[PDB]
């Protein structure tokens, strides 16, 4: 599994997330309550920002390459591919 | 080599070769046994 | 309700996967009218493979 | 030749009937459009969304069946 | 600073991606879920702009693509020469080009295709080729099928070389963008070397090979009797025998006494009457002139030294008052968009091919070619079609550029800009003029047929009735007829008999005669004009409003090809420049079909036939039947239909076969043309219910085609059926009657 | 925030004048005008076709339809992050410089926005048109 | 005979059009040498014609006023008058091979539906499994009737339906 | 004038509002969905029915549905 350090408005919380599990799903299974709505990669509700490490969000449809190049990630459809640090609740910073 | 084997196991080439095989079958059939009507 | 990863049959008529089976990703414990989260393997005519559902629209099958 | 043409006639009958019954019966709704009845017997199209709605009304279906009928006659 | 810039081992070589569909593109690389995946995969395989964004890599891709293209063409030519060497009667037809039909294709003794190996003369059993390879090779002077054997072999080798070239230049060493951009260098290189050298070498081969051997041919010596070409090259004795200028070798050329060389650089004009081909002396003079021209031409632009020119500089210089920035920045544009150069070259090339066919039937160069009425007609129609399609492809890729690479920020007030401004007035005037043209030119024939059915032929528009005589064309014809007197004192004969004069006869067949022009021809010319104007109209609309419109202010945002923007606000059906070029295909086919009809009938009626007077094929009926569409249909179509509609039991029976089959497929297209993908997907859902009812659904989700894809399938099949129907009809008719 | 007004005396951006311009409908029924202040001077593209240069700060342009100004707002808001405010004007001279005029922008939730035309229900819960029969006009079931 | 159809082994127009054919043949033939490939081919063609005709006559085909063979469609009639060799056996062979191919198709289809990569087996194929099912597919009819007696062929009422059924 | 309707399945991802080229849509507070946001059409008389909303709603049945109605000059998108 990958250690995902979530930098949240409540502080940092490092969770373990399997390679086959979406970031958002793992966070919820760990008891966290991150934002979401569509859960289908088609909106900005679940946006985070990757500070370090890599994700695979290939099925997402809402973000452009420059947004992803700056680290933005739709946590509902993103798998970790390394230990990573992700600031949560980033929707406002996307706009 | 294995890449090549996979390329041959790709679909349209397989469809191709099977069709070629069948067609050559039937053409040779008519060659050696011309003018079939009954039986 | 049903468990995550579990397999349920969809019964919502207006759904693409109606009369078919899906996999419960999760179910919300809040007051949402449709807490069941169920993936699918075939995509709809929209290409989506997961939809939200109330408890009745699905059945553990 | 008469055998043959008679079989052709039966063919055309079946084709016409097929398209006609399809159109008439799917009028209430469809998998693509369950609410087909909400658009009346005659609506232009639901547009190009969902891959493209072209000639989707039962009115359109009868519209098509015309040609087959003409061919048969 | 022009030089060579390359990158070594850029691309590797493995069959890995070969096992990976869609790897070139992002989305397709994800694999198929529904059926359109395969379609789009195929569709975008060669859209290198869609592939990536590297101009340089895209240049390298298209470079290797051209490599492979050339290799394909090499393969084809080589196989042609191979089958010419092995399965032909070319040597028989050499012994007698007057009563042996060129045939190079033999079929196998099977269920009944064997009947088609008809009798073309010389105990040969095959199919008459209308390509004219025979006359080609005779003009080039090929004698032994061994020569064609060698030819095909070398072609195989060349093709292999070209394909290796593509491979190397893509994976081993691929040049760099600036190298691709050294444009003036490329121009000078090509302009001088390629064309000048090719023409000059062809002239040398002519002089030292063909002119001697063709001279002996028309002298009448047996083909297997002439000495060998290299033997001729060895022995200047026989060359001086043929033309004593060769006794002096080349020193006269070095003394500028060209007059002496006149033995082989003539200016006769006209055809060799005993052959019907152009005067080979005149041909060689032509080609050497072309050679010198392009050679001196290829030294125009600066590459690495102070002398030369700057395309950019001159284009910026050329600006007029009414025009603002004139020709500025276009340099930047052309240096950047592939589709720009593409569309340019396509339009130019189509126009060329048209002119090629024109001059070719105008003054046939090949031995006894004019006699082969079928070959004439066939090659002509062929190249005409090719040219028109090149035109529409030009329009296509031009619109493509305008969608993709366009940028306002660099073109502020240029020709392009003011065009974009007053496009509405432009297109308006164009509409009006096309409507007037159609009205008048069509109603002429219609009023004729109307008076006819009304029994008032006195009131028609005929060369006998109310006339429209192309005084212009006839005056110009006579002008060319009288030109050599003074405007060309060193001339012997006009370039064409149709300027006026006598008739040339080879083997009874009408080789060439002067052609008059009646009110009928007036009308048909105006028809053609109107049709072409419609085509340019639809194309111009498509390209001008490809990015926007008062209806769609954001059309540039919907990509080049796109089905519609809904049924909203009335209905957005068929609103892409893609659709526009689609329509253009239609109107073009219409145009060129009309033109070839005109050509065929006028030929048959007032040109071709057999000399005795002239036994004209249709006896000039065209002259009085063409004014009325009833005469058209009956006397041309209904009449010449017999050959095809009774060709059965003959070797030509396949002509009627394919005739009916083309009818079939052309009608088959119409279901696509009219149907609806929504209806189709509905049927899909029904049938997949039927299948799943037996657990026989396919994994890949079956999907009805896109609106665009259905349009394309339909139009392809439609044009195919039409062209094939016409092709069959023409072939059977001419093989029967000529 | 408060509704702004329109100033007809605004230096309109730099453009050479096109032919895709306004028509009778402007002088007859209505026409819209767009108001925005650019941070700098810069060239841009005309939605109705053409390249134009905006001035520093106050810039003004008028149009007939709404979609023109809407697409233009998209272009500027996503390419230069400007917050224009365009109105609805009539040959009367009455303005309503309104097209997204609503304090902020609608793409974000905002207090005060009262829901409208919102069927507080599913869509499958609609009734057969056999019941909307013999009404005062063609009325859809979903109308209710 | 049947429907007033005389055998072309008896009919006149049969031999008439046969001779006419051979006449056209010799006509095209009379423009060559003897050893010429075209000559020998036309001769072989005449041979093939006469042989096919002798076979058709031996087949006992009822061939009417055209002298051309017309076929009968009744099990009882064909059996009673010795004419099964024209429709019965052909139809039977056809249905055999067709059911074979369809059955083995469904066999591979089920095998690959029992996979994790349905699309990938739909594109790239399992060569040896294909060969195996091909070898085994002969017993397709017995297998199918077994599964019928077990009622295991058809899918139950769970396939997707349209909302108005 | 065309007709447009919102349904409880609105997950408020606004793509509809994000898609309407005519601003005939907007988002409001809500509590039915996690987003607490409901789509809203206050300017229907401007919708030309180009349905790009309907295209954009990711909702199983489209949280929003368009219904073409009568024709006004604005409904037809005429600038003349
Ligand atoms: C059998 C030899 C061979 C092999 C193994 C490869 C291997 C490859 N070629 Mg190909 N290629 C070859 C010969 C070969 N090529 C030849 C003869 C040419 C000249 C026409 C090209 C021209 C060519 C191009 C232009 C491209 C490839 C591409 C590719 C890649 C994907 C192939 C699917 C891969 C590196 C694609 C690639 O590398 O994309 C990045 C690509 O764009 N090849
Ligand atoms: C590119 C043109 C071309 C075309 C259209 C044909 C067409 C044909 N070839 Mg092929 N053939 C060609 C070039 C071509 N060939 C070349 C370049 C080769 C070298 C591989 C061959 C070698 C070849 C042979 C050895 C034979 C054919 C034969 C045939 C016929 C059946 C296949 C058919 C008429 C057969 C034929 O002509 O039978 C009479 C035959 O036996 N071809
Ligand atoms: C369905 C039956 C059938 C079959 C199995 C074949 C088989 C063949 N045909 Mg074809 N052929 C057929 C019907 C058939 N043909 C028909 C109906 C036509 C009329 C359009 C032709 C016309 C035709 C020609 C003109 C030629 C072939 C040729 C060939 C051979 C090379 C390919 C091949 C043996 C080629 C051949 O024999 O090359 C030597 C060849 O040149 N065929
Ligand atoms: C472009 C092709 C070409 C080639 C390969 C040759 C080849 C040859 N020429 Mg040249 N020659 C050419 C074009 C060519 N010539 C042209 C265009 C002209 C017209 C100016 C001549 C006129 C010419 C003459 C008059 C003579 C040669 C001669 C020769 C031979 C000796 C060198 C050699 C066979 C000499 C020779 O031996 O001719 C047989 C010779 O006397 N050539
Ligand atoms: C008749 C002989 C001749 C002479 C004197 C020149 C003279 C010149 N050539 Mg050269 N050139 C010639 C023929 C000639 N060329 C031919 C036959 C070729 C082969 C196709 C070229 C191809 C060529 C190229 C590609 C270039 C020159 C260039 C030049 C110029 C600079 C070197 C110079 C004026 C350079 C230049 O700028 O030319 C305009 C240059 O880049 N030449
Ligand atoms: C020189 C030949 C040539 C080349 C290299 C291309 C190249 C291309 N064409 Mg094609 N095209 C051509 C001639 C050519 N076309 C002609 C003659 C026509 C007229 C039928 C068209 C009409 C055409 C259309 C309408 C389209 C293409 C498309 C394409 C692209 C995908 C393959 C690619 C850029 C597709 C594309 O996406 O282009 C960017 C596309 O939609 N072409
Ligand atoms: C655009 C071409 C054209 C032109 C220049 C003319 C010219 C003429 N037409 Mg018209 N005519 C045309 C098309 C045209 N017609 C068509 C398409 C039809 C078919 C409906 C007719 C049917 C027609 C009739 C029936 C009559 C004319 C008549 C005439 C005369 C003018 C009054 C003059 C001879 C009149 C006439 O005969 O004048 C001598 C007349 O009675 N025309
Ligand atoms: C309205 C546009 C139009 C167009 C595009 C053409 C096109 C043509 N005209 Mg002109 N022509 C037209 C109307 C037109 N014509 C009309 C209305 C008249 C009567 C004044 C003529 C009278 C006329 C004559 C007398 C001749 C042409 C000829 C031609 C050809 C060369 C110029 C070309 C096909 C020449 C030609 O080739 O005619 C067959 C020619 O000699 N035209
Ligand atoms: C597709 C429908 C069809 C049709 C139109 C015919 C037509 C015919 N059949 Mg029947 N037949 C059929 C299918 C059909 N058959 C099939 C599939 C079988 C296989 C079991 C048979 C087996 C069969 C036999 C064994 C005989 C006929 C006979 C006949 C002929 C006279 C009796 C009659 O009118 O039967 C009407 C057709 C039907 C009722 C269709 C259903 C057929 C069932 C399965 C069997 C019918 C047997 C028949 C009643 C026997 C009558 C004998 C007669 C001497 C009294 C007549 C040409 C008799 C014959 O040759 O007369 C010259 C005869 O002896 N048929
Ligand atoms: C008939 C028709 C269809 C239905 C036909 C379709 C979609 C084409 C089907 C193509 C083939 C037959 C399906 C693919 C078959 C696979 C390759 C499976 C293997 C088959 C073997 C024989 C190779 C449309 O979808 C359509 C859409 C828009 C305008 C017109 C039409 C139209 O006319
Ligand atoms: S119908 Fe057209 S105007 Fe209305 S919301 Fe949908 S896209 Fe926007
Ligand atoms: S209609 Fe769809 S995209 Fe629009 S707000 Fe509702 S859920 Fe979001
Ligand atoms: S919740 Fe919509 S993209 Fe993740």
Curated annotation (Swiss-Prot), chain A:
GO terms for cellular component: chloroplast. It is found in: Plastid, Chloroplast. [2Fe-2S] cluster binds at residues 38, 43, 46, 76. The keyword Iron-sulfur applies. Belongs to the 2Fe2S plant-type ferredoxin family. Its cofactor is [2Fe-2S] cluster. The chain holds residues 32 to 126 of 126 of the full protein. Residues 2-92 form the 2Fe-2S ferredoxin-type domain. It comes from Chlamydomonas reinhardtii. Forms a complex with heterodimeric ferredoxin-thioredoxin reductase (FTR) and thioredoxin. Ferredoxins are iron-sulfur proteins that transfer electrons in a wide variety of metabolic reactions. This is Ferredoxin, chloroplastic.
UniProtKB/Swiss-Prot annotation, chain B:
GO terms for cellular component: chloroplast thylakoid membrane; photosystem I. Keywords: Chloroplast, Membrane, Photosynthesis, Photosystem I, Plastid, Thylakoid, Transmembrane, Transmembrane helix. The gene is psaJ. The chain crosses the membrane at residues 7-27. It is a single-pass membrane protein. It comes from Chlamydomonas reinhardtii. Its main location: plastid. GO terms for biological process: photosynthesis. This is Photosystem I reaction center subunit IX. InterPro entries: PSI_PsaJ, PSI_PsaJ_sf. May help in the organization of the PsaE and PsaF subunits. It holds the Pfam family PSI_PsaJ. Belongs to the PsaJ family. It is found in: Plastid, Chloroplast thylakoid membrane.
Curated annotation (Swiss-Prot), chain D:
[4Fe-4S] cluster binds at residues 45, 54. Disulfide bonds: none annotated. Changing residue 50 to E: Loss of PSI assembly and function. Changing residue 46 to N: Loss of PSI assembly and function. It comes from the Eukaryota. The chain crosses the membrane at residues 3-21. It is found in: Plastid, Chloroplast thylakoid membrane. PsaA and PsaB bind P700, the primary electron donor of photosystem I (PSI), as well as the electron acceptors A0, A1 and FX. PSI is a plastocyanin/cytochrome c6-ferredoxin oxidoreductase, converting photonic excitation into a charge separation, which transfers an electron from the donor P700 chlorophyll pair to the spectroscopically characterized acceptors A0, A1, FX, FA and FB in turn. Oxidized P700 is reduced on the lumenal side of the thylakoid membrane by plastocyanin or cytochrome c6. The PsaA/B heterodimer binds the P700 chlorophyll special pair and subsequent electron acceptors. PSI consists of a core antenna complex that captures photons, and an electron transfer chain that converts photonic excitation into a charge separation. The eukaryotic PSI reaction center is composed of at least 11 subunits. Belongs to the PsaA/PsaB family. This is Photosystem I P700 chlorophyll a apoprotein A2. It comes from Chlamydomonas reinhardtii. The lineage of its organism: Eukaryota, Viridiplantae, Chlorophyta, core chlorophytes, Chlorophyceae. The gene is psaB. The chain holds residues 516 to 588 of 735 of the full protein.
Curated annotation (Swiss-Prot), chain H:
It is a peripheral membrane protein. It comes from Chlamydomonas reinhardtii. The lineage of its organism: Eukaryota, Viridiplantae, Chlorophyta, core chlorophytes, Chlorophyceae. Residues 1-30, 38-67 form the 4Fe-4S ferredoxin-type domain. Apoprotein for the two 4Fe-4S centers FA and FB of photosystem I (PSI); essential for photochemical activity. FB is the terminal electron acceptor of PSI, donating electrons to ferredoxin. The C-terminus interacts with PsaA/B/D and helps assemble the protein into the PSI complex. Required for binding of PsaD and PsaE to PSI. PSI is a plastocyanin/cytochrome c6-ferredoxin oxidoreductase, converting photonic excitation into a charge separation, which transfers an electron from the donor P700 chlorophyll pair to the spectroscopically characterized acceptors A0, A1, FX, FA and FB in turn. It comes from the Eukaryota. The eukaryotic PSI reaction center is composed of at least 11 subunits. Keywords: 4Fe-4S, Chloroplast, Electron transport, Iron, Iron-sulfur, Membrane, Metal-binding, Oxidoreductase, Photosynthesis, Photosystem I, Plastid, Repeat, Thylakoid, Transport. Signal peptide: none annotated. One of its GO terms (cellular component) is photosystem I. GO terms for molecular function: 4 iron, 4 sulfur cluster binding; electron transfer activity; metal ion binding; oxidoreductase activity. PANTHER family: PHOTOSYSTEM I IRON-SULFUR CENTER (PTHR24960:SF79), PHOTOSYSTEM I IRON-SULFUR CENTER-RELATED (PTHR24960). The gene is psaC. Pfam families: Fer4_7. This is Photosystem I iron-sulfur center. The keyword Repeat applies. Its main location: plastid.
